[PDB]
Design a protein around this motif. Structure first.
Motif, PDB file in Angstrom:
ATOM      1  N   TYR A   1     -17.245   4.088  29.426  1.00  0.00           N
ATOM      2  CA  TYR A   1     -16.867   4.035  31.395  1.00  0.00           C
ATOM      3  C   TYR A   1     -15.472   4.403  31.541  1.00  0.00           C
ATOM      4  O   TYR A   1     -14.550   3.936  32.540  1.00  0.00           O
ATOM      5  N   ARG A   2     -15.529   6.084  31.478  1.00  0.00           N
ATOM      6  CA  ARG A   2     -14.040   6.518  32.131  1.00  0.00           C
ATOM      7  C   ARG A   2     -13.907   6.252  33.031  1.00  0.00           C
ATOM      8  O   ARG A   2     -12.444   6.105  33.873  1.00  0.00           O
ATOM      9  N   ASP A   3     -15.027   6.444  34.114  1.00  0.00           N
ATOM     10  CA  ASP A   3     -14.233   6.561  36.029  1.00  0.00           C
ATOM     11  C   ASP A   3     -14.174   4.721  35.708  1.00  0.00           C
ATOM     12  O   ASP A   3     -12.762   4.404  36.585  1.00  0.00           O
TER      13      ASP A   3
ATOM     14  N   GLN B   1     -12.188   2.748  34.168  1.00  0.00           N
ATOM     15  CA  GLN B   1     -10.910   2.616  32.547  1.00  0.00           C
ATOM     16  C   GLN B   1      -9.598   2.644  34.093  1.00  0.00           C
ATOM     17  O   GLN B   1      -9.109   2.796  34.021  1.00  0.00           O
ATOM     18  N   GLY B   2     -10.644   4.258  34.406  1.00  0.00           N
ATOM     19  CA  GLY B   2      -9.073   5.144  35.823  1.00  0.00           C
ATOM     20  C   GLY B   2      -9.448   3.500  37.126  1.00  0.00           C
ATOM     21  O   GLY B   2      -8.289   4.330  37.537  1.00  0.00           O
ATOM     22  N   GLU B   3     -10.487   3.014  37.479  1.00  0.00           N
ATOM     23  CA  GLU B   3     -10.732   2.456  38.438  1.00  0.00           C
ATOM     24  C   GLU B   3      -9.052   1.343  38.533  1.00  0.00           C
ATOM     25  O   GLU B   3      -8.645   0.842  39.679  1.00  0.00           O
ATOM     26  N   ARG B   4      -9.367   0.204  37.608  1.00  0.00           N
ATOM     27  CA  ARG B   4      -8.807  -1.034  37.568  1.00  0.00           C
ATOM     28  C   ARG B   4      -7.922  -1.156  36.002  1.00  0.00           C
ATOM     29  O   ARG B   4      -8.870  -0.624  34.678  1.00  0.00           O
ATOM     30  N   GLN B   5      -6.516  -1.286  36.133  1.00  0.00           N
ATOM     31  CA  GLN B   5      -6.150  -1.458  34.262  1.00  0.00           C
ATOM     32  C   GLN B   5      -6.920  -2.327  33.318  1.00  0.00           C
ATOM     33  O   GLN B   5      -7.251  -2.246  32.609  1.00  0.00           O
TER      34      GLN B   5
ATOM     35  N   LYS C   1      -9.813  -0.879  31.659  1.00  0.00           N
ATOM     36  CA  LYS C   1      -9.498  -0.261  30.346  1.00  0.00           C
ATOM     37  C   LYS C   1      -9.380  -0.991  29.643  1.00  0.00           C
ATOM     38  O   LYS C   1      -9.694  -0.593  28.278  1.00  0.00           O
ATOM     39  N   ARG C   2      -7.637  -2.313  29.814  1.00  0.00           N
ATOM     40  CA  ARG C   2      -7.659  -2.616  28.308  1.00  0.00           C
ATOM     41  C   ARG C   2      -8.698  -3.217  28.573  1.00  0.00           C
ATOM     42  O   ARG C   2      -8.754  -3.786  26.729  1.00  0.00           O
TER      43      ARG C   2
ATOM     44  N   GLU D   1     -10.572  -1.111  25.682  1.00  0.00           N
ATOM     45  CA  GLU D   1     -10.106  -0.607  24.939  1.00  0.00           C
ATOM     46  C   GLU D   1     -10.520  -1.816  23.643  1.00  0.00           C
ATOM     47  O   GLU D   1     -10.567  -1.759  22.942  1.00  0.00           O
TER      48      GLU D   1
END
Ligand SMILES: [Mg+2]
Length: 157
Positions: free
Chosen positions: A107-109, A111-115, A118-119, A122
């Motif tokens: 879900y790279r998009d 991840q870049g949208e909300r930190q 992203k975490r 991970e």
């Protein structure tokens, strides 16, 4: 007890289908893996349009399984009509229920949208391979520096 589990239904079905066909048995196999281990909190998201007649460009096998899993309160259709919201529902639900996501999509998009997502991804993404009908998650999902699969699926070790 065990963390809530959210399955990216489309990712799992396509994976079991060798990325050529939407294989609904793949979803049932993934679901059963968790059920066999005693999980009760399992949600599989699939876009509602997967209930329609198969276009020739969108082949699907064992379609009857989707409504069966819906009836068992395991599968939840994500809305769509003549656009979709699938990945966001998956990530939002898992994040807000402090659960895990089963998918090979990272879900790279998002991840870049909300930190915070992203975490979350991970730490909570459970990847896998299918070998024919064998659903195979990693024994040490976060590596040597991580818990066993057993503890990764639990609220506490
Ligand atoms: Mg997706």
């Amino acid at each position: 007890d065990l963390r809530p589990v959210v399955i990216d239904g489309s990712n799992v079905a396509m994976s079991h289908g060798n990325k050529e066909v939407f294989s609904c048995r793949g979803i049932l196999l993934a679901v059963n893996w968790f059920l066999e281990r005693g999980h009760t909190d399992i949600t599989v998201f699939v876009p509602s349009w997967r209930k329609e007649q198969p276009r020739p460009d969108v082949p699907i096998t064992d379609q009857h399984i989707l409504r069966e899993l819906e009836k068992k309160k395991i599968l939840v259709f994500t809305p769509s009509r003549r656009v979709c919201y699938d990945d966001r529902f998956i990530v939002k639900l898992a994040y807000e229920s402090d659960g895990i996501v089963v998918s090979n999509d990272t879900y790279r998009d998002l991840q870049g949208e909300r930190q915070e997502w992203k975490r979350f991804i991970e730490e909570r993404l459970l990847m896998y391979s299918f070998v024919n009908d064998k659903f195979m998650p990693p024994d040490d999902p976060l590596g040597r520096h991580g818990p066993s699969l057993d503890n990764f699926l639990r609220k506490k070790p």
